[PDB]
C-alpha cells in the first residue's frame, strides 16, 4: 500500500518541490538532508539516478546520509521509482 | 533555432532508457569514455546534473574531468539537460 503523500508525489512533475514532499521524508529526515545539500526532491532523484535506480544502494545511501529507517527508505525509494516510471 | 537537431530531439520527449550518446554534445568518443565510468544511459548523466543542483560550472567541469569534454561539448550537454528539465522535471 501507499500513502497519499506518495500518490501526490508520483502524480505530477516534481519541479522545485522540497525534499520533504518525498514519501518517507518527514521533518527530521528533511532537516538532515537539507543540511547535507539535498534541499529539493530533485537532488535526491539525482542520487537515485546516479546509483542507476539500485534499491539496495539507494536505501543504504539514504540511511547513511540522513538516518532513514527501513520503512522511511522503502517509502522514499518507491515514490522515486514510480515517479521515474511515469515521467523519466 | 540555434540548437542542434540532436538537442531538439532530446528535449522533445522523456528520455527513458536512451543511451548517453543521445545527449547533445556527447559524440561517440565522449560517450565511450562516459560508459567506461558507469555513465551508460542519459538518465545517469541527468542524475549527476541534478546532484550538482543544475550548476553549470560544476556540471561542465565534472564532464571535462570525467570524459575530457571541451567547452562547446560541455555547454551543449548542459543546455540539453537544462532544457529537458525545464520541460519534464
From Swiss-Prot, chain A:
MF GO annotations: DNA binding; double-stranded DNA binding; identical protein binding; protein homodimerization activity
Residues annotated as domain HhH: 19-34
Mutagenesis or variant effect for residue 17 to A: No effect on histone H1/H3 binding
Residues recorded with modification Phosphoserine: 3
Result, substituting residue 57 to R: Abolishes interaction with LEM domain-containing proteins without affecting homodimerization and DNA-binding. Does not affect its involvement in nuclear membrane reformation at the end of mitosis
Modified residues (Phosphothreonine): 1-2
UniProt effect for mutating residue 26 to E: Fails to bind dsDNA
Effect of residue 24 to Q: Complete loss of EMD binding and reduces dsDNA binding
Expression by tissue: Widely expressed. Expressed in colon, brain, heart, kidney, liver, lung, ovary, pancreas, placenta, prostate, skeletal muscle, small intestine, spleen and testis. Not detected in thymus and peripheral blood leukocytes.
Keyword Secreted: no
GO biological process per UniProt: chromatin organization; chromosome organization; DNA integration; mitotic nuclear membrane reassembly; negative regulation of cGAS/STING signaling pathway; negative regulation of innate immune response; negative regulation of protein ADP-ribosylation; negative regulation of type I interferon production
Pfam family, one: SAM_BAF
Effect on the protein upon substituting residue 3 to E: Complete loss of phosphorylation and mislocalization of EMD in nucleus
InterPro entries in the record: BAF, BAF_prot, BAF_sf
Function: Non-specific DNA-binding protein that plays key roles in mitotic nuclear reassembly, chromatin organization, DNA damage response, gene expression and intrinsic immunity against foreign DNA. Contains two non-specific double-stranded DNA (dsDNA)-binding sites which promote DNA cross-bridging. Plays a key role in nuclear membrane reformation at the end of mitosis by driving formation of a single nucleus in a spindle-independent manner.
Family statement: Belongs to the BAF family.
UniProt name for this protein: Barrier-to-autointegration factor
Organism whose genome encodes this protein: Homo sapiens (Human)
Amino acid at each position: 500500500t501507499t500513502s497519499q503523500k506518495h500518490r501526490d508525489f508520483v502524480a505530477e512533475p516534481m519541479g522545485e518541490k522540497p525534499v520533504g514532499s518525498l514519501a518517507g521524508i518527514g521533518e527530521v529526515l528533511g532537516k538532515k538532508l537539507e543540511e547535507r545539500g539535498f534541499d529539493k526532491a530533485y537532488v535526491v532523484l539525482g542520487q537515485f539516478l546516479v546509483l542507476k535506480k539500485d534499491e539496495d544502494l539507494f536505501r543504504e545511501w539514504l540511511k547513511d546520509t540522513c538516518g532513514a529507517n527501513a520503512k522511511q527508505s522503502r517509502d522514499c525509494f518507491g515514490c522515486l521509482r514510480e515517479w521515474c516510471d511515469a515521467f523519466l
